[PDB]
Every structure is written in structure tokens, then in C-alpha cells.
Amino acid sequence: APAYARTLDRAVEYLLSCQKDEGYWWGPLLSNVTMEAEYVLLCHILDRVDRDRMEKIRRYLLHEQREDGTWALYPGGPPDLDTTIEAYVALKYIGMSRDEEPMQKALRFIQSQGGIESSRVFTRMWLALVGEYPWEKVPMVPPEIMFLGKRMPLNIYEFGSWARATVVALSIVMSRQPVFPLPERARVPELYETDVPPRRRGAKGGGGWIFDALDRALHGYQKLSVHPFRRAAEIRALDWLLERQAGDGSWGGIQPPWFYALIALKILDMTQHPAFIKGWEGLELYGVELDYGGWMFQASISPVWDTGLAVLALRAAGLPADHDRLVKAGEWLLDRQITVPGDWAVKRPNLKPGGFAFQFDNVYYPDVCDTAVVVWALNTLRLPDERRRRDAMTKGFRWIVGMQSSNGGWGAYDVDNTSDLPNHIPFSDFGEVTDPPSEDVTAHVLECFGSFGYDDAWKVIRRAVEYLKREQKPDGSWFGRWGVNYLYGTGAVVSALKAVGIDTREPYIQKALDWVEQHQNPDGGWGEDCRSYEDPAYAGKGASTPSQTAWALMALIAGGRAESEAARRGVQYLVETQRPDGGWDEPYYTGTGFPGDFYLGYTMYRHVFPTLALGRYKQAIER
Ligand SMILES: CCCCCCCCOCCOCCOCCOCCO
Ligand SMILES: CCCCCCCCOCCOCCOCCOCCO
């Protein structure tokens, strides 16, 4: 048996050993230290500071700090000002003196970059909440935003789902401009002393007279003593949040809206209300005790995604469709299907619910990637209740079809969330504020649809293929919206095109395959650093990683190049780097939350992607 077959066997065993008893897989989702620095400030604001938890956060913050005293958005990344400021503030709050060495190094970096005035809106706002920055200088999000109807400019349904609940809860918070002063010893006036002139970070899409004027007017309005209908607007914001709280207590299964909603409830004197109580208590599910004694808070949690990918990888590796561990995973997945309408129903009010979310319980926010991967995984299994499996797949498939956007692609949560307005408000200087269709999500949908044998005679698929063709870059690659980066998008897109019957001998696909081969590293693997999002010199370039090597391999295998020196060397790379336990290490992030601003380490990718790629490789070589 060739070396790759034994490597595969060991990967399969390792992946099965990671499965939880209930049937799902779930790895920690890594990001950056602003999650934990903001949890420290949240504890301060809510007056619920647990000393033992603070010690573990201190230990984690220091462990994440690099030797030059800075923190980054991803492992090996450039020093990040916003992140370093928040870690410094949380450390001083926990108890480190500004005279300790780690604090001095951090401060030197912070002051070298223009301090607190050069930091993003959310960092200044967290400081305003604790009395360290003026609320008058934070861009206003007025509660009267709730009066804008669904076809009005800047209404909440023009924002992407992850920004929408944030806008609603912050409209309550900014309405009151609450201040929860820090103890004297934790104050940070030193963050205003700068080496260089501070420079305000602006809106990602660029501001403009009308937007600066509106922001100025909203601050002037804020100063008035009477605000007609403001209370009514606040009640709409509160009701909107109360109706949509997720079953785990979060808002949308993600850190920002959750923390801001809890502050909004605190400010409204609702700490004895079940939404606040359950919202507070649910936080522990997202915390992770680390092996070196630290504690972290997950930006989000990925069990459905981890599970659907693991099933696909194990099926590709050779486990039968009725393997008992996969049957258990399949039955667990069937119970996660959502049968109620979510915010997506604003654009699709007659579309029958059938999606899946990322987290365990988040019914109002199913997403296209999880639905595609779960429907596809279910299609590879044989379960005891076949009629239930078929009905689930039909409902999920139909829900994906109904969520297709007008340009032929799919966004993650909504249809046609393409408004250009949210990009120009002062508030939006960080991350993405809208959810337009992207290449990788579209490609995953096509892989799912392709698994049922459909092709571009079906206009849904044809429109999607034309969208991918228009988005292909000049060098032949495809961008990675949610995975790192041109390797991820290129790998997803070529697999998708192959899966729906496109002839991979066409020149545009051959060009993408050559792009993949030209980026292979000397060690035989492929890698792509997160610097790729802001620097063209890093396109398809970085230290090799198991997951990015797997993506490149999948592009080559889908393109008919399994029997090529490039694929042989990639397989050998995976063989040679596999750990004794059958898994792989991956100290670099290969996930993307927001291009340029927020990166993710999906800890299962290093095991599930190599298993998947090696299984596809084996099948291509055997056939
Ligand atoms: C009976 C109450 C009034 C309901 C009438 C609806 C009137 C429509 O709009 C007027 C108020 O809305 C203005 C919104 O504030 C600006 C939005 O967001 C600011 C930038 O983030
Ligand atoms: C603003 C910093 C806090 C970051 C939270 C932003 C949350 C944005 O979503 C990113 C993580 O959640 C993944 C959701 O979408 C689908 C999951 O499948 C993944 C790739 O297609």
C-alpha cells in the first residue's frame, strides 16, 4: 500500500477520535485578543468581575503578546494598533502596572502609531463606555434608525447580518451614552500621548460631505434635551433584539452583538430580565480553558460546519455511507435543520425555511455555506430514516435555491445585500458591513448541487457559473472571502466547476490550475499568508499549511491533474508532515472573518482538509 494510503488511514482514525459522543465535531475558533479584552470590560460594566477568570485572561493575553510587546490579528502578522490598545487596557484593569516590561513595550508601540485617536471606532467606543474617551467623538448610531422601512437608505436590512444586531443594540447604547468609570489605577491617559500626529480612521468605502453632515447633525441632535419619538425608537430596538435572541443566549452566535445587547439591557435596567440572564449565562459555552492555563472567548462557534466537513472528508476517505459514526453525525445534523423564518425572510417572505446555522442553536440566522455543506453531507449518507433524510435534503436544497442573489452568486445570510450606503457611514471603519455574494460561497453551493448530478442546463447553476467567470481575476485565481485566500477561492471554484459538469479543459480553468502549480512551495506544500488581503505580492504565498495544501490539491485533482508532479509533491508533503497521532499542526490562520481586518483559525481545518484531499486523491488514482 502506497505511503499516502497509510497516511489517509491514520488521518481517518484521528478524525474519528475527535468526534464527540453525540455525533458532532467541534474545534475551537481562534481569532485575536480583542474578544477577551472586551469580555474584561464587559465584566467591569456589568459589575461581575471573577478574579480567577481575570488571572486566566491575563495569562492568555501575555501568552499571545509577541516579544516586541504587540498583538496581531493573526499568527506572525504585523503589530495591530486596535488589538494592542485593547489588550493593554484589559491588562492594566486586571492589575499589571504600566511600569511592567510587557506594558512598556505595548505602550511604546501604541504611542508610535498615534494612540487612541488613531484606533477604530469600536476601540474608542469601548473606551467611551468606561469613561476613558469622549462619547461626543464616537460616530452616532441613533435609535431612530428603527423608523426606516425596508426600502429606505441605511435601514437595518441593508446591513449584513453580523452588523445588523450590532447596529440595533448600539442604537440603544449610543442613545444613552452610558459611562462605567474604571478604578483610578486602571485609567489609561497614557494612550493619548503620541509620537506622531493621530489620524482618524475613516469609513471603509470613504466618507463624504453628506455623511459628515449627517453625523454632525446627529451629535447636535444628541445634545438637545428633548427627542420626540426617541423612546418609541428605543422600544422598537429593544423588541427587535428580544424577538431574535438565539437559543444559546447570544445574538446571532457571534461576540459583538451579544456583548452590545447585554450592555443595552444593562442600560435599560433589565438585569432581572430573562433575556439578560440567559444572555449572561450563555457566555460560558463560548469560553475555552487553555492547556497553558489561559482562558479565551470564541468569536463564534463552528460545530455544524466542523461536522458537515468531517462527514464529507470521511466519506471521501472511504468510510461507507452507513458507517455507524457517520450515521450518528447524520442524525445529529438532521435535528439541527431550522424550520422557522429568519431575517432572510425579509427578502424572501414566501420561501420555506430549510437552512442550517453554524452554531448549535441560532434559528434566525442560518447561512448558505452551512446549509450547502450539510445538505451535501446528508446526500452522501444512508440513514435509518431515509424519508426524513430526503425531506431534509429537499428543504435545505430548496432554501439555498431561494437565497440565490440577482447576480447569480450567493452571499452568506441574505439575498442581494449589496447596498453601497452602509460603507460610507463613519461607524463602518472596520470589517464588512454588508454581505454581498462571494465566489467561495457560490462555489460551495455548486459543489452541493453538483453532488445531485445537476449541471448548467439548470439556469440556477448557469447563472452561478457566469458569476464565477466574471469574478475570476486576471492571473486566473479566485478571491477567498471566508478562507485564506486565492488558494481557498481557487480550490473551491475549480472543484465546484468540475462538480457541475464544466469541461475543465477550457482555457480559463487551465489558467487557474497553472496559477495553482506556479504557487507551490519548495517543500511541496502550498501556503498563503493573511497579508495576501492587503498586498498583491502575497497572493497565493506564505508558509505551507496542511489546509492550504489540501485546497490546492483539490483544485489540481478536480482539474484532472491528480497524476502530475505538483500533486505528487503535495501528497508527499502531507505524508511527511503528518504527526504521529494522525493529525497535522497548523500555526497559521487559514480562515477569514473580514478581509483585511479579522482572521480566524478554524482548528479542525488542519485535520479535515488533508483527510478530504487525500481521500479525493485516492479516488482519482484508483479510478
Ligand atoms: C411615528 C414615528 C415616526 C415613524 C415615521 C417614520 C419616519 C421615517 O424616518 C424618520 C426618522 O428616521 C431617521 C434616521 O436616523 C438616521 C439613520 O442612521 C444614521 C447613520 O448610522
Ligand atoms: C468584529 C469582530 C468579531 C468578529 C465577528 C464577526 C462575525 C462575522 O462572521 C465570521 C464568523 O462566522 C462564520 C459565518 O458564516 C458561515 C460559516 O461557514 C464559513 C465559511 O464559508
CA of 457 to the centre of ligand 1 (A): 46
To test the pocket of ligand 2, the residue of 254, 400, 439, 481 to mutate (highest count of ligand atoms within 8 Å of its CB) is 254
SS3 percent helix, strand, coil of the chain, rounded to 5, is 55, 5, 40
Per residue, what are the HEC states of 227-247? CCCHHHHHHHHHHHHHHHCCC
Instruction: Tell me where in the chain the CATH 1.50.10.20 domain(s) lie.
Output: 3-28+301-621, 29-300
CA 246 to chain centre: 17
- Cα separation of 392 and 389, whole Å? 5
Contact (Cβ atoms closer than 8 angstroms) between residue 532 and residue 484: yes
Give CA separation, 498 vs 174, 456, 493, in Å.
50, 11, 9
Burial class (CB in 10 A: 0-12, 13-18, 19+), 507: exposed
Ramachandran quadrant class, 424 (left: phi over 0; alpha: psi -120 to 50; beta: rest): alpha
Contact predicate 42/259, CB 8 Å: yes
Answer whether 410's CB lies under 8 Å from 442's CB: yes
**222 CA to middle of ligand 2, Å?**
33
Buried (b) or exposed (e) across 179-214, using 16+ Cβ within 10 A? eeebeeebbbeebeebeeeeeebbbbbebeeebeeb
CA distance 197 to 115: 9
Q: Strand, coil or helix: what is 592?
A: strand
DSSP string, 107-128: HHHHHHTTTGGGS-HHHHHHHH
Our measurement of the distance from residue 240's CA atom to the centroid of its chain's CA atoms, rounded to an integer in Å, reads: 23
- Measured distance CA(533)–CA(482) in Å, rounded: 11
Q: How far is the CA of 250 from the centre of ligand 2 (A)?
A: 14
The verdict on the CB of residue 158 being under 6 Å from ligand 1 is no
Cβ neighbors of 344 (< 8 A, separation 6 or more) are 351, 355, 366, 403, 413, 414, 415
The C-alpha atoms of residue 344 and residue 5 are separated, in whole angstroms, by: 44
* Max Cα–Cα distance, the chain, nearest Å: 80
What crossing angle do the helices spanning 486-499 and 459-471 adopt, rounded to 10°?
A: 150
- Say how far apart CA 55 and CA 295 lie, in whole Å: 9
DSSP 242-298: HHH--TTSSSTTBHHHHHHHHHHHHHTT-TTSHHHHHHHHHGGGGEEE-TTS-EEE-
Quick one: fold of 29-300?
A: Glycosyltransferase (1.50.10)
**Contact assessment for residue 475 and residue 515, using Cβ atoms and an 8 Å cutoff:** yes
**Separation of first and last alpha carbons in the chain:** 16
| Residue 50 main-chain phi, psi, to 5 deg | -95, 110
Return d(Cα 496, Cα 447) in angstroms, integer.
Answer: 5
Compute the distance between CA of residue 299 and CA of residue 55 in angstroms, rounded to an integer. Answer: 20
Question: What is the residue type of 271?
Answer: T
> 423 preceded by cis ω (within 30°)?
no
Do 615 and 321 form a contact (C-beta atoms < 8 A)? no
Q: Is the CB of 147 inside a 6 Å radius of any atom of ligand 1?
A: yes
Q: Which three cell numbers stand for residue 252?
A: 446571532
- How many CA atoms within 13 Å lie on the side-chain side of 259? 24
Residue of 141, 145, 423 with the most ligand 1 atoms within 8 Å of its CB, for mutation: 145
> Residue 410 phi/psi, 5° resolution?
-120, 140
To test the pocket of ligand 1, the residue of 147, 212, 215, 218 to mutate (highest count of ligand atoms within 8 Å of its CB) is 147
C-alpha cell at 532: 495576501
CA atoms within 13 A on the CB side of 219: 12
| Shortest-distance Cα residue to atom 10 of ligand 1 | 147
- Which residue is listed with cell 439578560? 276
* Size (the chain), residues: 623
Å resolution of this model?
Answer: 2.0
Cell triple for 584: 497535522
C-alpha cell at 343: 431575517
Å from CA of 484 to ligand 2 middle: 13
Q: Which residues line ligand 2 (CB under 6 A)?
A: 162, 254-256, 299-300, 305, 358, 367, 369-370, 412, 431, 441, 482, 593, 598
Cell of 562: 491528480
Task: Tell the residue nearest (CA) to atom 19 of ligand 1.
Answer: 141
Angle at 367 between CA 250 and CA 554, to 5 degrees: 125
3-state secondary structure of 590: coil
Instruction: Give how far Cα 271 sits from Cα of 189, 244, 264, 277, Å.
Output: 31, 18, 10, 7
Those residues with Cβ within 8 angstroms of residue 366's Cβ, 6 or more apart along the chain or in another chain: 338, 342, 344, 353, 355, 356, 357, 399, 413
Q: Which helix (H) or strand (E) segment is 469 a member of?
A: helix 459-471
Helical residues (DSSP H) of 34-80, grouped into ranges: 34-45, 51-64
CA of 267 to the centre of ligand 1 (A): 22
Residue type (1 letter), 557: I
Give residue 547's identity as a one-letter amino acid code: S
CATH number for the segment(s) 3-28+301-621: 1.50.10.20
Is the shortest distance between the CB of 458 and ligand 1 below 6 Å?
no
Which one of the ligands is nearest to 151 CA? 1
Nearest to 319 by CA among 620, 114, 618: 618
Residue 520 has, within 13 A of its CA and on its CB side, a CA count of 24
Give residue 593 CA to ligand 2 midpoint distance, Å.
Answer: 5
CB contact at 8 A, 37 and 48: no
Closest CA to 367 of 410, 324, 306, 418: 410
CA distances from 247 to 25, 353, 357, 403 (A): 20, 17, 12, 24
Q: In sequence order, which residues have a C-beta less than 8 Å from that of residue 413 and are 6 or more positions away?
A: 160, 161, 162, 343, 344, 365, 366, 367, 368, 435
Report yes or no: 610 and 579 within 8 Å, Cβ to Cβ: no
Q: How many CB atoms lie within 10 A of CB 18?
A: 17
Place of cell 474545534: 27
The DSSP call for residue 300 is: B
The angle subtended at Cα 390 by Cα 386 and Cα 392, nearest 5°, is 115
78, 72 Cβ separation under 8 angstroms: yes
Residues 114, 106 contacting (CB under 8 angstroms): no
Q: Which atom of ligand 2 is nearest to the CA of 591?
A: 20
446: cell is 455548486
Q: Which atom of ligand 1 is nearest to the CA of 233?
A: 2
Structural contact between residues 172 and 264, judged by C-beta atoms closer than 8 angstroms: yes
**In Å, what is the CA distance from 392 to each residue of 24, 395, 447, 517?**
18, 5, 18, 39
Query: Which residues, in sequence order, are CB contacts of 339 under 8 Å at separation 6+?
Result: 353, 354, 395
Cα separation, 136 vs 38, whole angstroms: 21
Please state the φ and ψ torsions of residue 483, each to the nearest 5 degrees.
-140, 155
Nearest atom in ligand 1 to the alpha carbon of residue 232 is: 2
Burial call 526-542: b when 16+ CB within 10 Å, e when fewer: bbbbbbbbeeeebbbbb
218 CA to middle of ligand 1, Å? 11
Cα distances from 458 to residues 6, 87, 93, in angstroms, run 40, 52, 59
Q: Ligand 2 centre and the CA of 538: distance in Å? A: 23
What would the grid cell of residue 573 be? Answer: 508533503
Q: Whose CA is nearest to atom 18 of ligand 2?
A: 369
